[PDB]
Design a protein around this motif. Sequence first.
Motif, mmCIF file in Angstrom:
data_model
loop_
_atom_site.group_PDB
_atom_site.id
_atom_site.type_symbol
_atom_site.label_atom_id
_atom_site.label_comp_id
_atom_site.label_asym_id
_atom_site.label_seq_id
_atom_site.Cartn_x
_atom_site.Cartn_y
_atom_site.Cartn_z
ATOM 1 N N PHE A 227 74.847 110.471 53.901
ATOM 2 C CA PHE A 227 76.140 110.832 53.342
ATOM 3 C C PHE A 227 76.842 109.535 52.953
ATOM 4 O O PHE A 227 76.951 108.618 53.770
ATOM 5 C CB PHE A 227 76.975 111.591 54.374
ATOM 6 N N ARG A 275 78.347 129.573 64.870
ATOM 7 C CA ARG A 275 79.500 130.454 64.764
ATOM 8 C C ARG A 275 79.651 130.904 63.325
ATOM 9 O O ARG A 275 79.561 130.076 62.418
ATOM 10 C CB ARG A 275 80.754 129.713 65.207
ATOM 11 N N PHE A 276 79.893 132.206 63.132
ATOM 12 C CA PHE A 276 79.944 132.900 61.826
ATOM 13 C C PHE A 276 78.874 132.431 60.849
ATOM 14 O O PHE A 276 79.168 131.862 59.805
ATOM 15 C CB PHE A 276 81.339 132.898 61.164
ATOM 16 N N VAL A 278 76.308 130.652 58.769
ATOM 17 C CA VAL A 278 76.390 130.334 57.355
ATOM 18 C C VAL A 278 75.001 130.250 56.762
ATOM 19 O O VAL A 278 74.000 130.230 57.478
ATOM 20 C CB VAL A 278 77.141 129.022 57.108
ATOM 21 N N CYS A 285 79.112 132.754 54.277
ATOM 22 C CA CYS A 285 78.910 133.100 55.672
ATOM 23 C C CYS A 285 78.470 134.549 55.736
ATOM 24 O O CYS A 285 79.189 135.442 55.290
ATOM 25 C CB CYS A 285 80.191 132.932 56.476
ATOM 26 N N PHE A 296 83.277 134.575 67.991
ATOM 27 C CA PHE A 296 84.547 134.759 68.675
ATOM 28 C C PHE A 296 84.995 136.204 68.722
ATOM 29 O O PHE A 296 86.043 136.485 69.304
ATOM 30 C CB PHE A 296 85.627 133.924 68.012
ATOM 31 N N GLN A 337 87.749 126.300 71.802
ATOM 32 C CA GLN A 337 89.177 126.412 72.076
ATOM 33 C C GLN A 337 89.843 127.426 71.156
ATOM 34 O O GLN A 337 89.260 127.907 70.182
ATOM 35 C CB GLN A 337 89.920 125.101 71.853
ATOM 36 N N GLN B 42 78.572 122.295 60.353
ATOM 37 C CA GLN B 42 79.243 123.507 59.920
ATOM 38 C C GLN B 42 80.749 123.380 60.063
ATOM 39 O O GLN B 42 81.288 122.343 60.435
ATOM 40 C CB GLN B 42 78.799 124.725 60.721
ATOM 41 N N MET B 43 81.428 124.491 59.843
ATOM 42 C CA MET B 43 82.876 124.501 59.872
ATOM 43 C C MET B 43 83.330 125.463 60.965
ATOM 44 O O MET B 43 84.086 126.403 60.710
ATOM 45 C CB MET B 43 83.404 124.840 58.480
ATOM 46 N N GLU B 44 82.792 125.286 62.170
ATOM 47 C CA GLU B 44 83.200 126.070 63.325
ATOM 48 C C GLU B 44 84.350 125.352 64.005
ATOM 49 O O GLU B 44 84.172 124.234 64.491
ATOM 50 C CB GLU B 44 82.089 126.214 64.357
ATOM 51 N N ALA B 45 85.523 125.969 64.042
ATOM 52 C CA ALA B 45 86.557 125.422 64.911
ATOM 53 C C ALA B 45 87.408 126.451 65.625
ATOM 54 O O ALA B 45 88.195 126.041 66.489
ATOM 55 C CB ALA B 45 87.474 124.475 64.147
ATOM 56 N N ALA B 46 87.343 127.744 65.255
ATOM 57 C CA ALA B 46 88.127 128.886 65.749
ATOM 58 C C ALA B 46 89.592 128.826 65.360
ATOM 59 O O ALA B 46 90.342 129.756 65.646
ATOM 60 C CB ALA B 46 88.043 129.072 67.268
ATOM 61 N N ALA B 49 89.246 129.826 61.005
ATOM 62 C CA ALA B 49 89.004 131.210 60.638
ATOM 63 C C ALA B 49 90.044 132.167 61.188
ATOM 64 O O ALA B 49 90.182 133.269 60.664
ATOM 65 C CB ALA B 49 87.621 131.649 61.126
ATOM 66 N N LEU B 65 84.398 129.093 54.090
ATOM 67 C CA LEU B 65 84.059 128.808 55.470
ATOM 68 C C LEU B 65 82.585 128.441 55.628
ATOM 69 O O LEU B 65 82.099 128.293 56.750
ATOM 70 C CB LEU B 65 84.435 130.023 56.316
ATOM 71 N N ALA B 66 81.868 128.267 54.534
ATOM 72 C CA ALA B 66 80.469 127.876 54.560
ATOM 73 C C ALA B 66 80.265 126.632 53.741
ATOM 74 O O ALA B 66 79.332 126.540 52.950
ATOM 75 C CB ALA B 66 79.573 128.975 54.015
ATOM 76 N N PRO B 70 81.953 116.731 56.853
ATOM 77 C CA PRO B 70 81.361 115.417 57.133
ATOM 78 C C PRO B 70 82.153 114.606 58.141
ATOM 79 O O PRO B 70 83.375 114.509 58.047
ATOM 80 C CB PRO B 70 81.385 114.738 55.773
#
Lengths: 339, 338, 450
Positions: A227, A275-276, A278, A285, A296, A337, B42-46, B49, B65-66, B70
């Motif tokens: 990257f 999670r969800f 993708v 997703c 969740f 969290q 990925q973009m998991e943070a709770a 979403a 969300l997909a 970085p």
Amino acid sequence: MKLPTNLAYERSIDPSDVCFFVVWPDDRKTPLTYNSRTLLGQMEAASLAYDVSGQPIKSATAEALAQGNPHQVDFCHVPYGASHIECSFSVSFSSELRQPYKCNSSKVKQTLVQLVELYETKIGWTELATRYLMNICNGKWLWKNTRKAYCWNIVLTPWPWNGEKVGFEDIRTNYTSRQDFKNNKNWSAIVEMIKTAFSSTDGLAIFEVRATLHLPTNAMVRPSQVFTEQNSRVFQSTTIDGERSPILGAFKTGAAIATIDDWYPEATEPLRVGRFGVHREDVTCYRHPSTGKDFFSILQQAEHYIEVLSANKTPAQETINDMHFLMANLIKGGMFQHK
Amino acid sequence: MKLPTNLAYERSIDPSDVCFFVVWPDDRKTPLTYNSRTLLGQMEAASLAYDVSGQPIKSATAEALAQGNPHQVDFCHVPYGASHIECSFSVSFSSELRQPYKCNSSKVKQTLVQLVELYETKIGWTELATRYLMNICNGKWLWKNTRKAYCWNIVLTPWPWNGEKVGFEDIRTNYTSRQDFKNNKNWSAIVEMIKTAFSSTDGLAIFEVRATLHLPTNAMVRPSQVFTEQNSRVFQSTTIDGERSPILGAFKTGAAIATIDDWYPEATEPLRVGRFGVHREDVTCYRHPSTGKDFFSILQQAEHYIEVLSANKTPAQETINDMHFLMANLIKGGMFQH
Amino acid sequence: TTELKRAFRPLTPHINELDALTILVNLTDKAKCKQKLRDEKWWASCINCVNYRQSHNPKFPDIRSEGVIRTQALGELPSFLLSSSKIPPYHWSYSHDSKYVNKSAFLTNEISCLGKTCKAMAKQLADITLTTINVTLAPNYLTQISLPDSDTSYISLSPVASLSMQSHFHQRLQDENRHSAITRFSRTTNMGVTAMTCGGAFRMLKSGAKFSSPPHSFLVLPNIRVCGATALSSPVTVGIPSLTAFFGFVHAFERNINRTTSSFRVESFAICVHQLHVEKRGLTAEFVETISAPATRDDWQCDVVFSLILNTNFIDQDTLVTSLPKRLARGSAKIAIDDFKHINSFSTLETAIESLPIEAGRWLSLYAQSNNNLSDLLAAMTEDHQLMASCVGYHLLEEPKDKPNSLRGYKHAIAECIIGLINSITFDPNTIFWSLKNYQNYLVVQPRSI
DNA sequence: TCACCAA
């Protein structure tokens, strides 16, 4: 059931970088290398011929479009007199899903332990440990190198293990489906390591994987690439004998062991576990937060699965595939969290 | 007994940093290095979403969300054609527990000093020196590094010493319990250094510890990492020769020597020695002050712990674990004001 | 309205008499219309903010501390030293509660300050009470240092960060990405107004380039390797730790040996530094009572490997090792067991300096060049990229008195740091050796050659 | 005990 403001696990699978070697005909091993080289492509981009509206940019004449577009990529390839290529790394399976690494609610910490304990009592570690172990025992971690190749061969060296190294010769021909792995001499013994790794409060189970790629003459090998924020393809690298060589990212190698998720609605293909969950091919997703089947929304029904898993009546296929996804995230790790 | 408004001790055990080295199979020792390399998860943070009410958010659709996420981390790993890793620090035991560092009340200053000469007479430094030394000789000060390895050896080198550098070969197999440390050839020549240290007016007992970790191929190492207010995992470092090298802290080390506390009302695991003894797996205070077994509710009972140890009867386990926990906090040091 | 806000706030330089004071009314908001509204509780509470206007902020590392300081840097001091006297003393601020950090903008924005209008003035003039020290030492969080005065009897010193040195350094070091090293603090409205404006980041003075050591009765202590020290040598500069820390190391090494031999008395000490490595590590403070950690800060640390050559008034091996002191500026200092062979004394300096191993370090010699300012510092930091500034002594603020709570039963005065520039000699023997010098108004570790 | 407060 609410989610705490501090919750996290460590992961229960720990990969490493994959190193590439050139095995000459005399059986001597030299680290692989690469090089940057400039090139000259066409000027095909459609931002260079058509405007945002659709009508052509009038300054892009016929003569102007065919002008030559110079760029630069890194270019790695097998040498001429070489024979094959060694790839080699090491995995762990190490019981980090037994309890949270951090949790500041007392009720939630007692509940998530009872999911992990009622999962191995009622369902067992046979389905997960098989799905992880297939992606070691073929070239799922040799991502694109496996494609366009003659044959590849995998050789394990497990550590809490007495003798008889484990071999897998000529995949694409021999080890195609699940049953073709079970027919191995020592296969159920290795699955019993990962089942004893997850079932014990200190289960360790170190593997030592080594592969062998027979590419065509003067062929191409594709490592992982970096990257960056002018080179247009920069490879990831290390140092082996004082010469920089291409490597397969440790994070990348763990993203290949864990392509397990095919428990989503109308599922065809195994996704990476998250999670969800993708899909990076088509940027969407599956298991969206409106589907009711991401992580969740299964965490917040974790009391409901205790009345299911504790009864003598066997749970339905909807409510064990929700538990397969639930454990496979607790092996993945991450922070859970909210607020 | 009321507390002074000035009470403090220095610490009795004094560690150093832990350097990491690489031993090539031609016995060439090179210091360990690392790099920062960017990843993409990925973009998991709770939170990305779900909104604060817990209702699903309407900005982050299925496509948003997909997308890609970085970030940069420091990455330390064992080199390829290496053999093992030699991790070396050094300890000391100078007995700073004898008199206070700072105290205004001279009546109170007698009471804490007369507990110790009542302690080494009646109970003695066998019990705590058994416990501290079983954190140097096994792999507590290596933290996460001990986990996920083949084998590790520990080699001591004490200073008031004659011959036979003390060796501990292949832990996780041999040295599992308390008795297996006692059954070493020279274990009681070293417990009688810490006992000599704490019981002397100036007793010193330098060690020089050196580990040897046989890892898997090409494996991670986990040093301590910084606490500041971009790069999300910044390792602590020191300059060895001309290289940057990941270290383990002088306070990350000393917290591992002092995991002793299993004297609380419901103790299932040892805890780091401190006032109202905290756990950072589950964010709670065992020995909470409302329970009444924290450290300040033992100094107030230090007068009652003079008539206990002056009785000829051996006192119970209920009321010498308070005496052991009182000693382990005076060894740890720190301000005691209220 | 953000550029009018910064212009009156004490981290921008200063500045047709009706627009100003009708803006100064409107900086209590969190216009001419609400400028008319006169609450009697707004006039009487705005007098409380000048009552906690403070010269030197005692709450600067630790926001839990408790005390009020409206005094001036006491005395005068020579050209090569630098304190909050030599810079013109007018950037002061508010050091009290976060409730009143905007209501202090009416009478403490200050070239001078604004410290029934007549009724308000009568109360303010009587209690204005400039040149005020109100600190009680017992139930708060202050540093405390014992340093000897004359032949015997130490003096306790509590250094307090001056505000006019902070906002001076924060303004001049904007353009410098090389000589500036930012420390950030949290819960910054509890700190004060002079920390709100910068946002918590304070933009200290770093020692320029990196450290690189070229080859270079006298008891020799080799390879004193400190693991985790502090680089915050002043509240102003970061780098090599202070020279009252290297002095207090030796005078703990002396004072231990005076248990057996009661006349040891080191006169001076030669410092040979290898391998600084300054870095921002962390500091997990301990849980303090509702039981949670205290406020989060930022801390610089350094890993020194130096060697020390003393100068004694006139001893076994095992007497020295057990009487070494074990902390050099919060950091554990040790000699390895295999290096214990080199603690032997000598008689001539030319052999004692050829005696110690690992030869490749720089001796510390003070840069005695007339200076008064940060530009005076930074100009000398570029002709020598290896010149490093740090704390050299303590500039007092009042005379030492008897207090009910003092550090070890001595006389206590409040001090401030003194910043000097420090050379490095290849090897004037007297110049290399440092000693403690007492000045009726300060205390500075100078070389012998000054 | 809680209402106060910024870049």
